[PDB]
Design a protein around this motif. Structure first.
Motif, short mmCIF file in Angstrom:
data_model
loop_
_atom_site.label_atom_id
_atom_site.label_comp_id
_atom_site.label_asym_id
_atom_site.label_seq_id
_atom_site.Cartn_x
_atom_site.Cartn_y
_atom_site.Cartn_z
N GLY E 8 48.19 2.52 6.33
CA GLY E 8 48.92 1.29 6.20
C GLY E 8 49.18 0.90 4.77
N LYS E 9 48.46 1.50 3.77
CA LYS E 9 48.89 1.38 2.40
C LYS E 9 48.14 2.32 1.49
CE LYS E 9 47.37 -2.07 -0.24
NZ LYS E 9 46.99 -3.39 -0.78
N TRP E 10 47.10 3.04 1.98
CA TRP E 10 46.16 3.69 1.08
C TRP E 10 46.26 5.15 1.32
CZ3 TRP E 10 44.95 0.78 -2.57
CH2 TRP E 10 44.52 -0.54 -2.41
N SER E 11 46.52 5.91 0.24
CA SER E 11 46.73 7.34 0.27
C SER E 11 45.46 8.03 0.66
CB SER E 11 47.20 7.92 -1.08
OG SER E 11 48.42 7.33 -1.48
N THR E 12 45.59 9.10 1.47
CA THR E 12 44.50 9.97 1.82
C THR E 12 44.66 11.26 1.06
OG1 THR E 12 45.72 10.75 3.80
CG2 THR E 12 44.10 8.95 4.05
N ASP E 13 45.76 11.38 0.28
CA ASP E 13 45.92 12.39 -0.73
C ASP E 13 45.35 11.84 -2.00
OD1 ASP E 13 47.48 14.39 0.79
OD2 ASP E 13 48.94 12.71 0.88
N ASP E 14 44.92 12.76 -2.90
CA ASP E 14 44.08 12.51 -4.06
C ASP E 14 42.72 12.02 -3.64
OD1 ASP E 14 46.19 13.14 -6.09
OD2 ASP E 14 47.07 11.28 -5.27
N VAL E 15 42.17 12.63 -2.57
CA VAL E 15 40.88 12.32 -2.03
C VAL E 15 40.25 13.67 -1.88
CG1 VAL E 15 39.51 11.38 -0.11
CG2 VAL E 15 41.65 10.25 -0.86
N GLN E 16 38.99 13.82 -2.34
CA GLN E 16 38.32 15.09 -2.42
C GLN E 16 36.98 14.89 -1.78
OE1 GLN E 16 39.81 17.90 -3.81
NE2 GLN E 16 41.58 16.44 -3.93
N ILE E 17 36.33 16.02 -1.42
CA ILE E 17 34.93 16.06 -1.10
C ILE E 17 34.40 16.95 -2.18
CG2 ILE E 17 33.05 16.59 0.46
CD1 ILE E 17 36.70 16.30 1.77
N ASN E 18 33.41 16.43 -2.94
CA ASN E 18 32.98 17.01 -4.19
C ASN E 18 31.71 17.79 -3.99
OD1 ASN E 18 35.02 15.69 -5.97
ND2 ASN E 18 34.02 13.81 -5.11
N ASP E 19 31.31 18.00 -2.72
CA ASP E 19 30.29 18.95 -2.34
C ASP E 19 30.97 20.00 -1.53
OD1 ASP E 19 28.48 17.17 -3.46
OD2 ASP E 19 27.26 16.90 -1.63
N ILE E 20 30.35 21.20 -1.47
CA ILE E 20 30.77 22.29 -0.63
C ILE E 20 29.88 22.29 0.59
CG2 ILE E 20 29.22 23.93 -1.78
CD1 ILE E 20 31.48 26.08 -1.42
N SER E 21 28.74 21.57 0.51
CA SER E 21 27.76 21.49 1.56
C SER E 21 28.19 20.56 2.67
CB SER E 21 26.39 21.03 1.00
OG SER E 21 25.34 21.16 1.95
N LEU E 22 28.74 19.38 2.30
CA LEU E 22 28.92 18.29 3.23
C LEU E 22 30.33 18.17 3.72
CD1 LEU E 22 26.78 15.54 1.38
CD2 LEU E 22 26.00 17.34 2.97
N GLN E 23 31.26 19.02 3.23
CA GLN E 23 32.57 19.14 3.81
C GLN E 23 32.49 19.99 5.04
OE1 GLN E 23 35.17 20.79 0.84
NE2 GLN E 23 34.29 22.91 0.94
N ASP E 24 33.43 19.75 5.98
CA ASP E 24 33.47 20.26 7.34
C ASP E 24 32.57 19.43 8.22
OD1 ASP E 24 35.30 22.57 6.85
OD2 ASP E 24 33.52 23.33 5.76
N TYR E 25 32.21 18.22 7.74
CA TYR E 25 31.65 17.15 8.54
C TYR E 25 32.06 15.87 7.85
CZ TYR E 25 28.44 20.60 10.52
OH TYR E 25 27.85 21.73 11.14
N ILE E 26 32.71 15.98 6.67
CA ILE E 26 33.47 14.92 6.06
C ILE E 26 34.85 15.48 5.94
CG2 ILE E 26 33.87 13.48 4.04
CD1 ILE E 26 30.82 13.69 3.45
N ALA E 27 35.83 14.77 6.53
CA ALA E 27 37.22 15.14 6.48
C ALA E 27 37.94 13.85 6.77
CB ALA E 27 37.62 16.20 7.51
N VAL E 28 39.20 13.72 6.29
CA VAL E 28 39.87 12.45 6.34
C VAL E 28 41.35 12.63 6.12
CG1 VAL E 28 39.59 11.94 3.85
CG2 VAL E 28 39.67 10.01 5.56
N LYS E 29 41.84 13.88 5.93
CA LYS E 29 43.15 14.05 5.33
C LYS E 29 43.77 15.37 5.68
CE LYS E 29 43.66 15.56 1.05
NZ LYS E 29 43.69 15.56 -0.43
N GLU E 30 43.08 16.23 6.46
CA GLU E 30 43.61 17.52 6.85
C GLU E 30 44.80 17.36 7.78
OE1 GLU E 30 40.73 20.11 8.63
OE2 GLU E 30 42.06 21.89 8.60
N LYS E 31 44.65 16.47 8.78
CA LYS E 31 45.74 15.85 9.49
C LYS E 31 45.15 14.62 10.12
CE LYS E 31 49.90 15.12 11.13
NZ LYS E 31 50.50 15.89 12.25
N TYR E 32 43.91 14.24 9.71
CA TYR E 32 43.10 13.31 10.45
C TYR E 32 43.35 11.92 9.95
CZ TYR E 32 40.35 17.58 11.50
OH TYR E 32 39.92 18.86 11.89
#
Lengths: 68, 141, 227, 141, 191, 104
Positions: E8-32
């Motif tokens: 509704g106004k806030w980009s989900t691009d320029d959003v990163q997960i800065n661990d390699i451990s905790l991604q693939d259980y944190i996601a927000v922008k792949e199409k989600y």
RNA sequence: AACGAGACUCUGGCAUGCUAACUAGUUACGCGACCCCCGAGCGGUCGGCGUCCCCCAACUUCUUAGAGGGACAAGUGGCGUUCAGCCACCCGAGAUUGAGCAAUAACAGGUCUGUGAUGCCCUUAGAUGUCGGGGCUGCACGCGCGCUACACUGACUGGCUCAGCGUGUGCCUACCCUACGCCGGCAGGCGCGGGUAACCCGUUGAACCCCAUUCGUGAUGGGGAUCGGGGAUUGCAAUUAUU
């Protein structure tokens, strides 16, 4: 899950394949309609089971000999 | 020649019959604008297909919807589910396959019950509880 | 003569008439081998088909008893006069009629006879008449002032599922003695599966069997046969 | 425009003001001692509540087929906190609504029509849709 | 943007997960990424099915607790729209990167459990799933804002946006980064 | 004359009901009485939810009983004579019928 | 070989297929009437808003209820003796939506205050069988099932907007559900009308929720216990306060 077939299915499944071996295909739907005509199965859900086991047996009978 | 195809959607006994009749733009619900359907915080949700697909799919139809059943919430999902399918049916009948196959891939990607329906409705209560599972307290002394 | 009651209440009042009668008769025709009724309203007439095995004792000499019974109903439920018409009926095959079999055992017992030999005698009759199986219970006192139970069973029986409503009938009758009460219960299993009346449905109850015909021949060889 | 198009929170707040300018509505004396429903625990803060409620009266008659003093109360009724006892719904006042509808009828914006209910006069229906566009003129719809 | 929803106004691009451990259980922008956090009510009928649904929605779910707030998910979304708004004015970032740091900084690295020996309490140190870390970190910070606004003049929105700052930059003024370090301090001792 | 005569059926048994309706729709259409089909009305639930235990003791239990009535009606428009003639006959089961002079 | 398990019955979930509907709807005009130019245009017309008009119109998607079909571990990939089965995936409604029915044998379990079911004993005219009054609500205390609360994710006052399972006088012996009109702050009163009920109440115009004011961390406007006075309704009678 569960849903292990009972003996009432396995008894008549063997019989129906012995005396109507020719009529069988290997498709579900064709083997259903045959069982409907060569016999009456008094339920609908029961019919859908006995066909599926008749199908599953007919796969193995086209290999080596079954012992049942 | 008159063109008119109808669809519906459901969620939790909330029917929404959305007819797609030939015309131009102007989607309404109950003879009111969709812009003012009233929780107006879920306003982005019923708008979602129209906004995502573009407004140039909605340029050969006048859609109006009648509803009934459900609460404030479940109605919103019903009107969304109907308008999504309404648009599709218009292409399924008067335009070719490859037009609507494309549109099907887009919606079903972010499927959220736009082209399908929940089978979930309330379970029937049995005695010894105020709910269907929850039970009254048990005392031994 | 109007108006008329709600459709919901229409069925309840019919049920009350169906039930009251069925216990009225059982207290008079007990010795005559009562077995039930079947009511039918017909155009401008009532039919009450009074099923009992021996129509002889029901009728009486000059039809006295049937005349008493018709005059009773004509006053009791406030029927319009002369509309009521009784009919009798004899049932054939009496060993599938659990209600009558139980109430016959009652008078055999209350006549003064041993229990074991009486239970056996009724058993083989209901087995002979046709029946997959059958059961008898006698719960109450005998040989002292503590109660016991005595089961006599032969053949098949069912106890579970929806077939219980079709393929068995069950009856209960109290019989008195000088020391307390004795409970009789009779449970009998209906045998028809090939066809007819049709009464109970053709499939088998507990294990539902696959009815299996057989044909299998070939002698075929190629030829053309013109017709 | 039709009154359907616009917001309804805005509708009443301009319609209430409209009436009070024009000398319209002869009000009851009791208006400063009136709880206003059985399920309230206080009088309104508002000192011009009568003007506000007559707005909401005339609007509902535009939509629905029109109904009497009973039905208006049922539309307005809410929840009654009975203290230690569990809450239940109940209906509010009647004699207020009976003054509202007769006061409107004095201006001939409503009138007792057939089929068991007052219905809004064509002069009334003119005046609603007249100010309905004034709403869109004001802000910008 | 025209093919992927914002918030509704806030980009989900320029959003990163800065661990390699905790991604693939944190996601927000792949199409989600979606306009709103809501679901049709499918979220769980398999163990893996929990993971898929957004982090922003998960936050809204765990915000409504303790009796009077259950079954009021729309009221809950009001608090979240103000939260991001307050976070953006207050510090000035893509306000999702705040939240992602706040979750990652609050998840424990080691945890203890119980083990029965001699009818007396003994404890054993064990590790923790990435899925556990996310579930715990979402729980902990939501307890903070719930606790603070229980007698404060401040609203829960204000309290919650403060709680994500002090989590996103560790400073131990939050209920989360305190309680995180308590667990690890135990896990050192009995190990 | 030709009067809109309504043959209402009402029953509790779906077999006994439906076949007796069919008989009257055949015999009517056979004679070209311009018969109008069955209008099946909502089946209604009588519920009775009461104790299963006399003199309550032991674990608290109940028992749901239900009766399902059925209504459906066939509208005919033809002379009242041949209707009242053919209607009352050819009914085997215990199923009720109510003839109406007019309704439309 | 038999009983229980399963099978079975009911219920939910899948039909733009089938069957047919002024005690159910939709669409289409015919429309004429009202409304505002609100948009092109001028107000007409075209478009938009509901209602009356609707038929000898068209249809049955929605609603209703009947007959049928559909799901079987069926297909594929792993695993298993490669048997019985198990795991993942495609299609999609995944092999578990929830209930009903339920064996053998037993209990000194409950019920003589459901029973004109019943043994024995007791009582039976100074009656354990009828009218009047009182009690089962009586409190220094102990325990159980629950209800309402301790606030700002709130209360308060206005505004907006959505539902379903049912039920209803003509019954027991005197009794129903209520629209509409009028009077009253309210409880309520009064005048008329409908409903045997997919027909009238009821297009059940319900709450939480939603939108805008006010209160401000204060045992506060949170909480509503205790208690005084007054007004109504039911009944033959309301005191130990019927509501």
């Amino acid at each position: 899950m569960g849903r292990v077939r009972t003996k009432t299915v396995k008894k008549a499944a063997r019989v129906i394949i012995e005396k109507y071996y020719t009529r069988l295909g290997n498709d579900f739907h064709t083997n259903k309609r045959v069982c409907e005509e060569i016999a009456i199965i008094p339920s609908k859900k029961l019919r859908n089971k006995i066909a599926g086991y008749v199908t599953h047996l007919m796969k193995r009978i086209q290999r080596g000999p079954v012992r049942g | 020649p008159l063109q008119s195809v109808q669809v519906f959607g459901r969620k939790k006994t909330a029917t929404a019959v959305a007819h797609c009749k030939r015309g131009n733009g102007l989607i309404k619900v109950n003879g009111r604008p969709l812009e003012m359907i009233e929780p107006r915080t879920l306003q982005y949700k019923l708008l979602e297909p129209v906004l995502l697909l573009g407004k140039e799919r909605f340029a050969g139809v006048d859609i109006r919807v009648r509803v009934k059943g459900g609460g404030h919430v479940a109605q919103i999902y019903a009107i969304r589910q109907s308008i999504s399918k309404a648009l599709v049916a218009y292409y399924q009948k008067y335009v070719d396959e490859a037009s609507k196959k494309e549109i099907k891939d887009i919606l079903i990607q972010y499927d959220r019950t736009l082209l399908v329906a929940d089978p979930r409705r309330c379970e029937s209560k049995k005695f010894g509880g105020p709910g269907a599972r929850a039970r009254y307290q048990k005392s031994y002394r | 003569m109007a108006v008329q009651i709600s459709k919901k209440r229409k069925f309840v009042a019919d049920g009350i008439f169906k039930a009251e009668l069925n216990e009225f008769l059982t207290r008079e025709l007990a010795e005559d081998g009562y077995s039930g009724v079947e009511v039918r309203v017909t155009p401008t007439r009532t039919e009450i088909i009074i099923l009992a095995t021996r129509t002889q004792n029901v009728l009486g000499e000059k039809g006295r008893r049937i005349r008493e019974l018709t005059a009773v109903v004509q006053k009791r439920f406030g029927f319009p006069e002369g509309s009521v018409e009784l009919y009798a009926e004899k049932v054939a095959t009496r060993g599938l009629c659990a209600i009558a079999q139980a109430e016959s055992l009652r008078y055999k017992l209350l006549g003064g006879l041993a229990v074991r030999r009486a239970c056996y005698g009724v058993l083989r009759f209901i087995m002979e008449s046709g029946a997959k199986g059958c059961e008898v219970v006698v719960s109450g006192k005998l040989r002292g002032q503590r109660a016991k139970s005595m089961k006599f069973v032969d053949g098949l029986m069912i106890h579970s599922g929806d077939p219980v409503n079709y393929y068995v009938d069950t009856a209960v009758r109290h019989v008195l003695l000088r020391q307390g009460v004795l409970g009789i219960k009779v449970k009998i299993m209906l045998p028809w599966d090939p066809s007819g009346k049709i009464g109970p449905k053709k499939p088998l109850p507990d294990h539902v069997s696959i009815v299996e015909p057989k044909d299998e021949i070939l002698p075929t060889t190629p030829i053309s046969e013109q017709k | 425009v039709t009154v359907k198009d616009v917001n309804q929170q805005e509708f009443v707040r301009a319609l209430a003001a409209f009436l009070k300018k024009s000398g319209k509505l002869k009000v009851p004396e009791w208006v400063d001692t009136v709880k206003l429903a059985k399920h309230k625990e206080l009088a309104p803060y508002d000192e011009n509540w009568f003007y506000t409620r007559a707005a909401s009266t005339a609007r509902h008659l535009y939509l629905r087929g029109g109904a009497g003093v009973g039905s208006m109360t049922k539309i307005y009724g809410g929840r009654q906190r009975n203290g230690v006892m569990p809450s239940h719904f109940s209906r509010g006042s009647k004699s207020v609504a009976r003054r509202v509808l007769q006061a409107l009828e004095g201006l001939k914006m409503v009138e007792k029509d057939q089929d068991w209910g007052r219905k809004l006069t064509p002069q009334g229906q003119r005046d609603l849709d007249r100010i309905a566009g004034q709403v869109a003129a004001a802000k910008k719809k | 943007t025209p093919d992927i929803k914002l918030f509704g106004k806030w980009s989900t691009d320029d959003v990163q997960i800065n661990d390699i451990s905790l991604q693939d259980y944190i996601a927000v922008k792949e199409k989600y990424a979606k306009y709103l956090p809501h679901s049709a009510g499918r979220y769980a009928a398999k163990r893996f099915r929990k993971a898929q649904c957004p982090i922003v929605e998960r936050l809204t779910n765990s915000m409504m607790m303790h009796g009077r707030n259950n079954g009021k998910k729309l009221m809950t979304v009001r608090i979240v729209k103000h939260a991001f708004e307050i976070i953006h004015l207050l510090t000035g970032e893509n306000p999702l990167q705040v939240l992602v740091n706040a979750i990652i900084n609050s998840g424990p690295r080691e945890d203890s459990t119980r083990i029965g020996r001699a009818g007396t309490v003994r404890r054993q140190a064990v590790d923790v799933s990435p899925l556990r870390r996310v579930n715990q970190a979402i729980w902990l910070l939501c307890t903070g804002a719930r606790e603070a606004a229980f007698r404060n003049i401040k609203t829960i929105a204000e309290c919650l946006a403060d709680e994500l700052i002090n989590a996103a930059k560790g400073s131990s003024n939050s209920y989360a980064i305190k309680k995180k370090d308590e667990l690890e301090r135990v896990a050192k001792s009995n190990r | 004359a030709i009067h809109r005569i309504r043959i209402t059926l009402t029953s509790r048994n779906v077999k006994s009901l439906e076949k007796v309706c069919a008989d009257l729709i055949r015999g009517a259409k056979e004679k070209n009485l311009k018969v109008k089909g069955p209008v099946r009305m909502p089946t209604k639930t009588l519920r009775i939810t009461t104790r299963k235990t006399p003199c309550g003791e032991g674990s608290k239990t109940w028992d749901r009983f239900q009766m399902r009535i059925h209504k459906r009606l066939i509208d005919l428009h033809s002379p009242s004579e041949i209707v009242k003639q053919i209607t009352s006959i050819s009914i085997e089961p215990g199923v009720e019928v109510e003839v109406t002079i007019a309704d439309a």
